[PDB]
Curated annotation (Swiss-Prot), chain A:
This is Non-receptor tyrosine-protein kinase TYK2. It comes from Homo sapiens. It is linked to Immunodeficiency 35: A primary immunodeficiency characterized by recurrent skin abscesses, pneumonia, and highly elevated serum IgE. It comes from the Eukaryota. Tyrosine kinase of the non-receptor type involved in numerous cytokines and interferons signaling, which regulates cell growth, development, cell migration, innate and adaptive immunity. Plays both structural and catalytic roles in numerous interleukins and interferons (IFN-alpha/beta) signaling. Associates with heterodimeric cytokine receptor complexes and activates STAT family members including STAT1, STAT3, STAT4 or STAT6. The chain holds residues 580 to 868 of 1187 of the full protein. Observed in all cell lines analyzed. Expressed in a variety of lymphoid and non-lymphoid cell lines. The modification Phosphotyrosine is found at Y25. Residues 10-258 form the Protein kinase domain. Belongs to the protein kinase superfamily. Tyr protein kinase family. JAK subfamily.
Length: 258, 256
């Protein structure tokens, strides 16, 4: 399951963002490590249980491209997951700031590294369920000459099962359409993230309204094809409404290495 | 000497601070993110000292030395266009992270500062403004197994063009021989290592100009660093006799 952390061992620093029912802060863990604290909102037992399952999944795994989870601190109305601090933070933010100046090869190295960590979770028959640019952290940047990127996939936060329909609609286009009303969902998540990467942090449908987003899935519309034809075949296969028709990560990984 | 930049190619954004006769702003260069060092309305000797600074930085190349794009000169305007280093001045970071900066982190910063100064020593060039504020953090070195990465900024208006009042303001970083050679950067380095050790708090910093001048006039020596890891190096560097200061080749070997 997961390691337990005392309130005394953690220091909450600057605010980094807000997730689904969470607030993200930089922090210190006690000699002293830089950590990232995911503070759950005052929640019911079913919400908190979904949070512990997330901590468990991440605690019980080990992969070079998967972010480490130290444990969980239980403090009054808040629950605090203590996770790995990664030098450069989310990928989507860096993609928007570096818009137009990110090489194909850089995006191609990041695809393989994401497939590998997901291939690893596929072999263990485990589900991430929140693959998106925001959950991709850059350990090493790779935008500078002679540098190659190194990513770590973050924890998926509160499990998708505990979210309302409104919250699941907010996750379009990354949310697999079968989850709107299995490991197959991470292949859709992966395909949508590859489109976000290709479009330098701009996911299709991101700007559009919840009704427009729901309508797109309700009408079985397909997402745009990526700008780079090296991934067009892979994304079309991944972003199919039939879960069984999505390739395995073992296949995906072989297709990128060629 | 230096590259010339047109007024049209630069956009001045937010104000970051004030230096000796300058105002530091964030900006864009045609749009690449830069730092603009806007010289105050100055006389020709002041502007000439500003161009010499741009030259020194333009004509060098080092991994731990900040890049200078060029200078924009139009009417009374003198704008040095320099590299934007992600996290900014080291002294600011050090005060905000006071008590939580490891000894190992500081030695990295020290070796990298010593490297960019050994490089300038081999080319027989003078920086003349080594201080925490002129040390910029490119990479923070906060994640496990990662090291900080620094870049030494341009020294701003050359020390030669400054008044006595302005030189007194530079104590304890200003070498005492400059109060009334490459040897000065060894004092600058020594004083910066004390500032780093004391988490951004340089000794004498709070004290008055008369108190500061009095300290140098009376030949008093600066406090010894908290970490005995650098106590021998700083005592050697912060000697009033310029010739008695070790070379950066020596300093670098002592740090490795
Ligand atoms: C497991 N470790 C992590 O999560 C982690 C590690 N290191 C970081 N470093 C770092 C470093 C710098 C310099 C920096 F400026 C920012 N951050 C950031 C990390 N998290 C993180 C940070 C900020 C926002 C989010 C966030 O919006 N989360 C909620 C969300 C919204 C939408 C979709 C998905 N999730 C966030 O979570 C990914
Ligand atoms: C090559 N250009 C640089 O050095 C530079 C590059 N990147 C920066 N990034 C950055 C980033 C963040 C997040 C930030 F919040 C600020 N800045 C800041 C940079 N300069 C800079 C900025 C502000 C003040 C000074 C300054 O006090 N100068 C005058 C002075 C006073 C006393 C002693 C010596 N010099 C200053 O110059 C060092």
């Amino acid at each position: 399951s997961f390691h337990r952390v005392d309130q005394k061992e953690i220091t909450q620093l600057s605010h980094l963002g807000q997730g689904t029912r969470t607030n993200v802060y930089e922090g210190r863990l006690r000699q002293e490590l830089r950590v990232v604290l995911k503070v759950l909102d005052p929640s019911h037992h079913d919400i908190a249980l979904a949070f512990y399952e997330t901590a468990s999944l991440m605690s019980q795994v080990s992969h070079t491209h998967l972010a480490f989870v130290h444990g969980v601190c239980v403090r009054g109305p808040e629950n605090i997951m203590v996770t790995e601090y990664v030098e450069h933070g989310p990928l989507d933010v860096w993609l928007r700031r570096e818009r137009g100046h990110v090489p194909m090869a850089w995006k191609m190295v990041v695809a393989q590294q994401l497939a590998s960590a997901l291939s690893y979770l596929e072999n263990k028959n485990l589900v991430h369920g929140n693959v998106c640019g925001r959950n991709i952290l850059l350990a090493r940047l790779g935008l500078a000459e002679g540098t190659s990127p190194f990513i770590k996939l973050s924890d998926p936060g509160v499990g998708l099962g505990a979210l309302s329909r409104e919250e699941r609609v907010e996750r379009i286009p990354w949310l697999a359409p079968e989850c709107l009303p299995s490991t197959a969902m991470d292949k859709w998540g992966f395909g949508a993230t590859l489109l976000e990467i290709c479009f330098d942090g701009e996911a299709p449908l991101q700007s559009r309204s919840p009704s427009e987003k729901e309508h797109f899935y309700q009408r079985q519309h397909r997402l745009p094809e990526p700008s780079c034809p090296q991934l067009a075949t892979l994304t079309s296969q991944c972003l199919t409404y039939e879960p069984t028709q999505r390739p395995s990560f073992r296949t995906i990984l072989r297709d990128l290495t060629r």
